[PDB]
Design a protein around this ligand. Sequence first.
Ligand code: BCL
Ligand code: BCL
Ligand code: BCL
Ligand SMILES: CC[C@H]1c2cc3[nH]c4c(c3C)C(=O)[C@H](C(=O)OC)c4c3nc(cc4[nH]c(cc(n2)[C@@H]1C)c(C(C)=O)c4C)[C@@H](C)[C@@H]3CCC(=O)OC/C=C(\C)CCC[C@H](C)CCC[C@H](C)CCCC(C)C
Ligand SMILES: CCCCCCCCCCCC[N+](C)(C)[O-]
Ligand SMILES: CCCCCCCCCCCC[N+](C)(C)[O-]
Ligand SMILES: CCCCCCCCCCCC[N+](C)(C)[O-]
Ligand SMILES: [Cl-]
Ligand SMILES: [Fe+2]
Lengths: 299, 246, 281
Amino acid sequence: YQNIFSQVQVRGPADLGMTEDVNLANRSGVGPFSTLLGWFGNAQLGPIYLGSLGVLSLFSGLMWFFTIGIWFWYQAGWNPAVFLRDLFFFSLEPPAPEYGLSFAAPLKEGGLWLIASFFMFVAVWSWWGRTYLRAQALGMGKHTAWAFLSAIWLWMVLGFIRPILMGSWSEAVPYGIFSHLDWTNNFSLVHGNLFYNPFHGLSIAFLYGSALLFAMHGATILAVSRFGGERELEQIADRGTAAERAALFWRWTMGFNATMEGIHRWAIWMAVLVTLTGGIGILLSGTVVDNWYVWGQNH
Amino acid sequence: DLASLAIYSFWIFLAGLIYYLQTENMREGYPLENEDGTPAANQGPFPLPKPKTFILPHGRGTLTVPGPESEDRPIALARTAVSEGFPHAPTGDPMKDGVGPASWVARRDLPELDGHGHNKIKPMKAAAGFHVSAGKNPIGLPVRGCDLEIAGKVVDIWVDIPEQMARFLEVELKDGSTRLLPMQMVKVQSNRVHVNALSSDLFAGIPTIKSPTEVTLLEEDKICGYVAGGLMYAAPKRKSVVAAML
Amino acid sequence: ALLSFERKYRVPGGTLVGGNLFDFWVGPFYVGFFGVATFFFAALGIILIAWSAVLQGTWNPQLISVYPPALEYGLGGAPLAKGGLWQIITICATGAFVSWALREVEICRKLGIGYHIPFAFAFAILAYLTLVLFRPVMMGAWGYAFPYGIWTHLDWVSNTGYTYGNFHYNPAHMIAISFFFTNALALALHGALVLSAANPEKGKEMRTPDHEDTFFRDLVGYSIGTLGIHRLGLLLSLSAVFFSALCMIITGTIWFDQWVDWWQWWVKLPWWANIPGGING
Ligand code: BCL
Ligand code: BCL
Ligand code: BCL
Ligand SMILES: CC[C@H]1c2cc3[nH]c4c(c3C)C(=O)[C@H](C(=O)OC)c4c3nc(cc4[nH]c(cc(n2)[C@@H]1C)c(C(C)=O)c4C)[C@@H](C)[C@@H]3CCC(=O)OC/C=C(\C)CCC[C@H](C)CCC[C@H](C)CCCC(C)C
Ligand SMILES: CCCCCCCCCCCC[N+](C)(C)[O-]
Ligand SMILES: CCCCCCCCCCCC[N+](C)(C)[O-]
Ligand SMILES: CCCCCCCCCCCC[N+](C)(C)[O-]
Ligand SMILES: [Cl-]
Ligand SMILES: [Fe+2]
């Protein structure tokens, strides 16, 4: 038994959650239980908290999705069959370079893209405030909101900050499955191969490193779940043989180890650094460095 | 060159972060010791971080780390060589003495509490509304040890209420008493519960719990430590795969 | 030197080879038969690399590069300085990796824990072997493998990728990328959640796993749980590497053209293939 999937599922009264300082009036009712999810993790769905911020975020998010969708339908000639077969080829493109950073572009030539970006902007940022507040209501630290900022940073750089620094919305990424992939490839081409961007190399190290560390950590906790290992918070407050054996496995393996609390600091940074370095590398592209190969030759 | 200053600065930051992370991961187990218990000469380059204090819920005090090593119980092991870096062999029964892969830690002799201050784990029998929702119900099944002999029967499942999960199987032995078997150390089959880590004769030896309705962290550790220790120390009594196949 | 709680664990037993022969430590590191096997392979391999650096006429880390045999050599051996010295180093790397995994298994045995780690690591090894062994052999030549050089292996990645246009179109590659991205997302979330509960607002009591659940439930309407998160993290990581190897093993073996064209199968589906309009109509 590897404890990857549960052998027997157990179920009791739905958990309504801790109260603390949260406005219980904004908490929904408990959803259904998924036996399917129960094999891997918890079966309980919900409840969810939906205050004003969450409603705003959900609304914008849907509007963003809707804006892209209506454009796609237009591109499909309102024909369901065409919509489906060309779904990955449709693309909501930003304004042409001639429009600079103005909002004067005609709807079908960038305006819809600007509207979509506005909705996504509001959606993402209101959601960020939500990650902060939901934590505040429980008296918890703001680690989630901070980690989220790192992801937001790469996103901000790609569709707002960099386009603005270069005076053109045409520098932003289009909304399309395949098109945003073309944009990515093109971006590297146009900047002299991103494999030469030092910050792209780091970003990759952390992306690979996050898969490395989580394979390591996830496997370690599972390896010591026979000693109640996943109950990490209590292991931090009162170290058990689970924490000791996990530490010693690594100390004996690579010469050094972590603690039950410390490993999560290594974790959050390993992941956060992916988009942190990534964002910097993209921000420098085209604004300070036109060709990374060339830049590389002078460093 | 801005890009150059940026990358140069990053490495400075990264070295500082790694430094921070490492010291932060020295809140336990340090200072390092010599195999005899005395402070080791080489403590490494990273210095111990300054103390931090965790405020524990429901009158359980506080926890300050780094702090003096808590572990003080007797360790039934003896040096094997004059030089450092060698194994320390058990002086008595490793399973009974709690050493090697049978080790346990002197954790708080109180049950882990949930967010309300209630016991996190509880026999399903007493967990209002809890039931097996999917999979083979192990309750009622005989329990076989690695020697392929029956060691007892499952009389209940101890559940983690907040996480709604099976954490221990309560197994009644021949003498009418019961023991708790870690869920992740058993294999529920259609007609039995198989425990590879232990031979039937070792079940009586599983550490017991004071109260029949709760289990403390100290007890959990002794129990889990003991069971895992069987993989090594019960190997002589563990029958082959082909034998088990018959 | 030992951690202040390590002694009771430094017990004999757990080895798979040599009984108690190598059953000992060196500082914090444990040895074991596979500890020396790893040292052997690593040393020899590093040595064969330093020697290739000599034949190449360089000592600079940025420049050193060991290339596999040219396509002319097919799957046969080759002159040391012309592909052969790479073939040996590859054998050494494989040996050192597998030994490192097996050493981890002995460590698991001694500590009484699961074998999840070395099992997870085998995936990384398998991804490596896919690029250096399985794909080359399937394609018919060691030349298809990548070179051992800090920047040269990036050239290989770039050149190999563009041989099929924009590699982004490889469907297996897309799935792999999702896992890599989702994994980093979950790793950040997991690290932040644990820490936010262990480090609540100044002066407050340490939070509980229940608060972790409430937080995420309040946030997205679900909590996978402490067990599930670690299960998930392992699954995302391994799935990422699994699809990585899969996206490559199929490239140049059963797919040879521009990956973007593979997607024509969906567009050409009988029922909508000829409907005018849209992008492909
Ligand atoms: C996976 C797909 C491609 C590939 C694509 C890329 C791309 C694309 C990039 C890298 C990058 C890196 N690659 Mg690569 N790379 C491949 C296979 C390998 C193998 C291998 C044995 O299979 C190794 C050892 C490396 C090693 C490296 C690192 C030098 C560097 C950062 C990786 C990292 O942090 O990982 C996460 C792991 C950790 C954080 C743990 C630490 C690992 C350390 C840093 C590895 C050092 C390797 C050492 C120099 C190699 C020789 C070892 C001995 C000295 C002989 N690659 C395959 C062929 N690699 C990045 C770079 O900056 O390139 C210059 C980068 O941009
Ligand atoms: C041919 C193309 C170029 C190339 C062009 C680029 C470009 C261009 C960029 C990268 C970037 C990256 N590249 Mg590259 N890259 C190349 C080759 C490689 C190779 C390789 C060959 O092996 C590798 C491993 C990588 C790896 C990577 C990553 C390290 C990095 C992306 C980080 C990330 O997590 O982003 C994913 C994370 C995000 C985008 C953040 C998302 C956050 C927002 C807030 C989410 C909102 C969600 C939303 C509301 C909608 C859904 C909501 C629903 C509820 C689900 N590249 C080649 C050379 N690469 C990025 C980077 O950082 O560069 C330095 C980047 O911009
Ligand atoms: C121009 C290039 C093409 C392209 C061409 C390719 C090619 C070609 C390949 C990939 C591969 C990958 N690409 Mg791509 N790819 C592109 C753009 C992207 C983008 C992006 C955002 O645009 C992303 C995110 C990715 C992502 C990915 C990953 C899914 C995958 C690499 C990871 C891997 O296989 O790990 C696997 C991990 C390993 C191989 C590591 C093994 C480590 C070993 C076992 C141990 C080493 C120990 C070390 C020696 C120790 C030293 C001692 C020290 C003390 C540590 N690609 C562009 C369009 N991509 C690779 C792949 O799928 O590989 C199978 C691959 O070969
Ligand atoms: C499969 C899922 C992910 C994963 C998991 C993983 N990796 C692991 C483990 C796990 C679970 C370990 O337990 C093990 C470990 O101990 O980690 C600390 C490990 C490990 N993953 C490592 C690296 C690594 N993992 C990577 C990836 C991944 N690891 C996946 C994303 C990558 C990349 C590039 O993405 C790298 C670089 C090592 C740090 C470590 C294993 C240490 C080891 O094998 O040591 C023995 C060998 C030596 C000390 C030296 C041998 C030297 C060779 C003879 C040189 C040959 C040259 C080489 C082939 C090319 C070098 C040039 C490059 C520039 C291309
Ligand atoms: C602009 C993005 C910067 C984001 C950096 C956030 C890193 C996450 C750090 C976790 C540490 C949180 N903290 C401060 C409370 O300790
Ligand atoms: C339903 C289709 C959704 C499209 C998925 C593609 C998302 C790419 C998003 C990149 C964000 C665009 N921007 C603002 C940065 O330019
Ligand atoms: C905290 C995680 C530590 C990971 C550090 C990994 C560093 C490998 C860096 C190689 C990439 C650097 N680069 C682009 C300049 O070559
Ligand atoms: Cl903190
Ligand atoms: Fe964890």
